[PDB]
Amino acid sequence: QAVPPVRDWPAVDLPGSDFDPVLTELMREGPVTRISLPNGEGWAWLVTRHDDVRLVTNDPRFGREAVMDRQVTRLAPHFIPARGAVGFLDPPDHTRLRRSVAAAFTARGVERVRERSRGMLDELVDAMLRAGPPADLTEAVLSPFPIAVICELMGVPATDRHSMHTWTQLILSSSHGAEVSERAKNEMNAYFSDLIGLRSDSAGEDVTSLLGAAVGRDEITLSEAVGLAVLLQIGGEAVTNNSGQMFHLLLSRPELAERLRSEPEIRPRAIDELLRWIPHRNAVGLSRIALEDVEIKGVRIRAGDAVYVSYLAANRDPEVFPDPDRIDFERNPHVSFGFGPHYCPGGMLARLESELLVDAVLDRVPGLKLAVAPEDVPFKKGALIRGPEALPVTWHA
Ligand code: HEM
Ligand SMILES: c1ccc(-c2cnc[nH]2)cc1
Ligand SMILES: [Hg+2]
């Protein structure tokens, strides 16, 4: 028990939204297990229960700053966040940086861009309807919408949306092992250095304006501000893959789609349940290092050891979610947006986007449905975040 066997967790592409069989086995073995991923060196501890995941992610004894130096076993060939980025920061610095933009990401904060976002979405959907079926829901709506929304919230001119997306793709491609010069990945860095440091020098409510003002008041450095802007910009694109899984599920189970289309009142609750259930990523992402000797469920974890949490596993904890594999719109303390200091700042924005998307796609498109069999919809390979490559759809024209 104190010395669990190391389980090898090689990279494997899973069909649609099927749950990882290896994760299912780890969940059955006990609260604390040990794993070895494709990259990095050695092994790491893993926790899967809802309460243990909340502990590891919300306790000062586990830190992110120490992860970078020790080649911890991991899925990705290379990390996305750089040294000093919020992902690799611990309080107090992490707290100081996150607070500079927190008010822009709460429910009250994201409401500011809700009307404009709904307008942009209706234009994308209407353009799709006008062109006629069949179409690729991902290329026509799910991909462009999130990019436009995060750029709007950040204060990035619409004319630069395409550039932002290309830069985001290069950075993510680099994580997959692709060879990209630092000079290539720092283009977004230079872009935000200009926007935050030279422009948006006046009063503003968008994210880059808040960052610029915080730098002006000596609360954060330009470097800290730029690093945060880059990660927020990249993060905004996650809604594309997640909403893609959401619609693949809804269209694969016409019954659920009918329920949402006919019962507007339950959409908020239903979307929250889909967010809990959808297996958003492959394996696990960034670990935390035990900063001192600690114990979890009696298991001794030595200072220096790496510990991963699986939010996907925690979302299926039988204790917290009875009959976990069942999607129940009337079920929900899920942790799809993480837990602890590092919880996703984009959670409320993702909810906003998901709600607008469900409304538009289910109410504006006459008799929407998949144009191919559920099993024939291609999903991303060798990826970190799971999602459809395309979503062929048709409707009444
Ligand atoms: C359904 C969509 C999304 C999901 C499921 C999601 C999920 C997550 C998860 C699980 C984490 C890791 C928490 C940890 O490190 O323990 C995270 C971090 C993060 N997400 Fe998201 N996210 C989504 C959308 C977004 C969006 C739209 C943005 C941009 C506003 C964003 C920005 C970030 C940032 C900056 C972090 C790093 C936070 C930190 O380490 O302090 N996310 N997200
Ligand atoms: C890899 C791992 C996590 C993410 C992410 C977190 N929040 C939004 N995107 C993006 C790429
Ligand atoms: Hg963008």
Ligand SMILES: [Hg+2]
């Ligand atoms: Hg994620």
